[PDB]
């Protein structure tokens, strides 16, 4: 599989790149949100977890 394997983009992570971040893509009161509140799951897989594949 060829996902992207880019563990350098710790910000956009991957699923936060712009898939379902329209809700947390604007940290108002909470943390970044952009990933932890926009994705609340794959906000960590910023390339490290390249084992996802498919």
Q: CB within 8 A of 4, min separation 6: which ones?
A: 14, 47, 50
In Å, what is the CA distance from 16 to each residue of 27, 49?
13, 14
User: How far apart, in Å, are the Cα atoms of 51 and each of 6, 25, 26?
Assistant: 12, 26, 29
Domain range enclosing 22: 1-54
Experimental approach: NMR
Rounded to an integer, what distance in angstroms lies between the CA atom of residue 21 and that of residue 27? 11
Total domains in the chain come to: 1
From residue 26, alpha-carbon distances to 3, 7, 34, 36, 41 in Å are 26, 23, 6, 12, 17
């Amino acid at each position: 599989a060829q996902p992207k394997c880019n563990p350098n983009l710790h910000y956009w992570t991957t699923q936060d790149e712009g898939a379902a971040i329209g809700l947390a893509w604007i940290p108002y009161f909470g943390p970044a949100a952009e990933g932890i509140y926009a994705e609340g799951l794959m906000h960590n897989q910023d390339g490290l977890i390249c084992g996802l594949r498919q």
